[PDB]
Amino acid sequence: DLKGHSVREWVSMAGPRLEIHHRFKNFLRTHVDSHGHNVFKERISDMCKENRESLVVNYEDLAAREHVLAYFLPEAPAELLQIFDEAALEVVLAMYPHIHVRISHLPLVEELRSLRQLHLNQLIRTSGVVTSCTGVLPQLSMVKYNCNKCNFVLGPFCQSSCPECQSAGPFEVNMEETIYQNYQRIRIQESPGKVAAGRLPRSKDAILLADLVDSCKPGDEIELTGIYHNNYDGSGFPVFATVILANHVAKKDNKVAVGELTDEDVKMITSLSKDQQIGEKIFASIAPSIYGHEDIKRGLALALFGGEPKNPGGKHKVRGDINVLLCGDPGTAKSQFLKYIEKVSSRAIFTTGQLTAYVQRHPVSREWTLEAGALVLADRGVCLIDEFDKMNDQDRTSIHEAMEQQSISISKAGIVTSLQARCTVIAAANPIGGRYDPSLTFSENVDLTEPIISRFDILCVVRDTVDPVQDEMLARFVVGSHVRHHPSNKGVEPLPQEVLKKYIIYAKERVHPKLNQMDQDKVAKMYSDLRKESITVRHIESMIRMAEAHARIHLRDYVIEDDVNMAIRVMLESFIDTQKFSVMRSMRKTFARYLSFR
């Protein structure tokens, strides 16, 4: 029955083994649930409709109906899993002359850093983000060779001179064992935003055999349930590498569905949104550790709020994300902005130009695997790339393609697929020559080609001007920061960072602006004016995206009167900031009215 001496030994016993098998088989019929629809019959019918030999079993049902059985599942995963597999196979044959059973809804979920030897050789469910995946490797076979003229068996040799007598004979196979008759190897790391900053994210390797093969793509956040057990690996004797034998996989839709907030905080967020001035406060809180660069703060707030992606459909999709590029002379604290947005925005990653994805032969073994780059890893998040001006030519082409499509199609050896990355790029780089040249324009004084520049909603220039009062304020700020942080030490008002993050999440996931009304006359007249002055529809789409973002900042439904004005102001200011000195002056003079509209 139960309460033996060891759970593994107890299940191994034939008596209790068949007892549990019969009990599970009976449960395969009794459990009609309160609905009375014969849940197991429905599952069998669904499986046999497509003959998927994949059964889904909810741990809650087993625990409630049986209790003891579900309790023993964690301690003896393989045995009870085989029992359930044989029971399901027998049931399917009876109804429709191998069946794999996949469990889910495990009560406790452990992070990668949360699992240790206490969880070795047990079933567990974790939440991670895929990073790399290989093909459907055929098989891993361990071959042990009986020695030629000596009482000894050569150590296991992996596949996919005697240590004592030094016999030169070819030897004969004493024992060959097959493992992973058809398997795919993936790597899952801690989901971005759950890492403790300095700590390097944990990574683990999962093997999906037969069932679940190719059920995931690099860059996909998945809740993976499986047996975390030691096992051989492709490498005297073979190295024993701990892995997770995948039993069930899932997909976390939208890559963010926490919904974790305090209703009081939500009400406060809405009330502040009703308060118009809060928008200015948001700007003020973009860079608490910086002084000046208010325009950069507004641009970064716009990027954080991104925009509602409109989808024309087959032709294309309007990428609601706002791509920003910060360029300027050194000492402008661009990297400080990147670090700020990284630490604030959830589901964001940071990297340097010295990305996308690529297939390479995993050096640890001889196996081609696709690796998920920064862009795909971010997916529905934020990607920060510093030193963006320093990248490989292949990297430049790939990032151009990704920004043009928000998805990269890979057609490498034995791997053809497409990885989707709806990632908001906040990239930064430096001029070509360090110092910024007022005469040469943005596309000239920076070592970036025009195809990349085109796919950037906002381009901003940071100039280290020699101004006395502002420099004095900067000196005061930096001295204060240094003194207050000594190790022996221990306009509108800003917004607390926590509440700002709550606002970002809530607005980004709830409010989605629209275009019920139309000021198309004003927009078209402005575009014609710009053409008469210099502009392309790319500017128009960027303008509408940032207008949607600004509306989201105030949780507006369709649009506010100043929304289009703010979008035009931002676009025009950037466009002027990316011109020559004489051209910049001419544009400023011509557009003085539009800029003064504010």
């Binding site: 004493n174 024993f240 340097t352 995993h362 640890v364 280290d464």
Partner: protein, 591 residues
């Protein structure tokens, strides 16, 4: 069923010590330590060797003599002690870590006679291998007689059962490993070498492999100096054997009040006089650089680098650099390499290297395949070896682009994140860098900007606190003085130096001064503000512009100068002197 009376007696006495020994408070400290150990990720408990020695000298002597023999029984005692006490997981590995061992042997002294006995060694990590689970107590089943062989301990090799379990059956060749039932433990292979302190001159260091397990697996990162308490053991290698130091505990190698109490009366009196010695700045510069003439500013900057500023970490997890970086761009000869050699020779923890080094590490941490194991290993480079020290890099202008970007990242973030071949690590490197370089074409064109004179990338130049330009003056007096210095040195083989302070005295004074962390007074704050106002107003033409990076370098130099006199607060004197130094280091175009 054979009972080792020594092992059982040691287990009994160890359990008694755990459950009776108490701190000065009268309570069992180890009870609370284990209570802390119940938490996940805490499977190793530290034990003070001196404490158990006081509790039972015979027990300590036996453990020292036969540490390896009794260690499993100590672990069993810990398991029994923790299991019955609180709600600890019924079955997870536990270990005992020993510390406070007075006997500190040298890697030279590790002889086969010391195999199996506890000992503490001090070394510097060189390379670190990936973690790997390894079977310790395997379980097998005989294929013919289908009987489960259990607890067939393996001595660090794939040791199958000698013969079947059943006397009836004698398969002896077809045992099947039960992975699930097998007991595994996580091992990491590290390599360590003799620390430069113990290294004899011109002698190749001894490389010793060590095994880390349990809490110690990730404790030691590549390039750092650490002390390991463990036991030397033998491991068979393809009756060949090789030595490996299985380390139970790993600790970092070795306050102002603590140092002063430890310091001798005469040494403390000398240091106190040094602190009270006015004009100690120039005196110490001249003492530290006898075989040099002129270049007083270079010596000042090098000394300030030797002292270093106060590192600061913000509340937002941002690290503000505390140490400074110096570069010396000089015409052919002019004693640049001499400056670097003097700095390396004087200061322990200072490592000299050249930008032409072809080592796989390449002046920074790298990932390389082991020739034998063929597994990628994180090999520490010279820059890592200079951890919390100084890296005197010569031929800095000739560095490779790979090493150039690595060094840029290191000096920017003070840490190197190395990821490749599936291996990943984040090695801390807080190292002051003293670089030597030559102008493009060999001779410095004072009518050209510094950028045009050197090939270093803009980020590298920006992240350097001070640049010192050494131009070969044609003045007859300077050449005459240089000849005088060199000839006097070569003739008066010794005694030509005039050291107002001895090298050991300077070393101990530097160690004492390091303990201070000078603060900035509001007067100092406004003085710094005004000095930066003047520096910005200068706005010239200068070789390289002036940015907030220069302000950071200024405040770091001011902190270092405050540390010079050991005063705990900044004064306008330090700020003004630092401003003078940095402003003078600026060179204007002479066109």
């Amino acid at each position: 069923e054979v009972r080792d009376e020594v092992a059982e007696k040691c287990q009994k006495l160890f359990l008694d010590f755990l459950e009776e020994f108490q701190s000065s408070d009268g309570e069992i400290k180890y009870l609370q330590l284990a209570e802390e150990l119940i938490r996940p990720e805490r499977n190793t408990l530290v034990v003070s060797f001196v404490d158990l020695e006081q509790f039972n000298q015979q027990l300590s002597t036996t453990i020292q003599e036969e540490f390896y023999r009794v260690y499993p029984y100590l672990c069993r005692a810990l398991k029994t002690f923790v299991k019955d006490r609180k709600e600890i997981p019924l079955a997870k590995d536990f270990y005992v870590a020993f510390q406070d061992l007075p006997t500190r042997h040298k890697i030279r002294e590790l002889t086969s006679s010391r195999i199996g006995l506890l000992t503490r060694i001090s070394g510097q990590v060189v390379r670190t291998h990936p973690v790997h689970p390894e079977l310790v107590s395997g379980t097998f089943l005989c294929l013919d007689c289908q009987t489960v062989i259990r607890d067939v301990e393996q001595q660090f090799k794939y040791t199958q059962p000698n013969i079947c379990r059943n006397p009836v059956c004698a398969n002896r060749r077809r045992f099947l490993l039960d992975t699930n039932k097998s007991r595994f433990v996580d091992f990491q292979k590290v390599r360590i070498q003799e620390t430069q302190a113990e290294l004899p001159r011109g002698s190749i260091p001894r490389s010793l492999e060590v095994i880390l397990r349990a809490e110690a697996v990730e404790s030691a990162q590549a390039g750092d100096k650490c002390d390991f308490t463990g036991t030397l053991i033998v491991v068979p290698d393809v009756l060949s054997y090789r030595l490996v130091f299985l380390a139970c505990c790993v600790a970092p190698t070795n306050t102002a009040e603590s140092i002063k109490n430890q310091m001798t009366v005469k040494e403390w009196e000398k240091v106190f006089e040094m602190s009270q010695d006015k004009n100690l700045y120039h005196n110490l510069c001249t003492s530290l650089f006898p075989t040099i003439h002129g270049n007083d500013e270079v010596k000042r900057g090098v000394l300030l680098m030797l002292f270093g500023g106060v590192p600061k970490t913000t509340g937002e997890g941002t690290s503000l650099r505390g140490d400074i970086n110096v570069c010396i761009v000089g015409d052919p000869s002019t004693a640049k390499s001499q400056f670097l050699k003097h700095v390396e020779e004087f200061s322990p923890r200072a490592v000299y290297t050249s930008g032409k080094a072809s080592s796989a590490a390449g002046l920074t941490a790298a990932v390389v395949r082991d020739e034998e194991s063929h597994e990628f290993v994180i090999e520490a480079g010279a820059l890592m070896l200079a951890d919390n020290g100084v890296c005197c890099i010569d031929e800095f202008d000739k560095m490779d682009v790979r090493d150039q970007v690595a060094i840029h990242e290191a000096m920017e973030q003070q840490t190197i994140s190395i990821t490749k071949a599936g291996v990943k690590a984040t090695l801390n490197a807080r190292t002051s860098i003293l670089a030597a370089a030559n102008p493009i074409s060999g001779h410095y064109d004072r009518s050209k900007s510094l950028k045009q004179n050197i090939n270093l990338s803009a980020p590298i130049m920006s992240r350097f606190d001070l640049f010192f330009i050494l131009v070969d003056e044609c003045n007859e007096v300077t050449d005459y003085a240089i000849a005088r210095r060199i000839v006097d040195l070569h003739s008066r083989i010794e005694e030509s130096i005039d050291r107002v302070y001895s090298l050991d005295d300077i070393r101990r004074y530097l160690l004492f001064a390091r303990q201070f962390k000078p603060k900035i007074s509001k007067e100092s704050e406004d003085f710094i503000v005004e000095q930066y106002k003047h520096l910005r107003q200068r706005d010239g033409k200068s070789s390289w512009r002036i940015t907030v990076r220069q302000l950071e370098s200024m405040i770091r130099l001011s902190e270092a100068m405050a540390r010079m006199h050991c005063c705990d607060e900044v004064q306008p004197k330090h700020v003004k002197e630092a401003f003078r130094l940095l402003n003078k280091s600026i060179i204007r175009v002479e066109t």
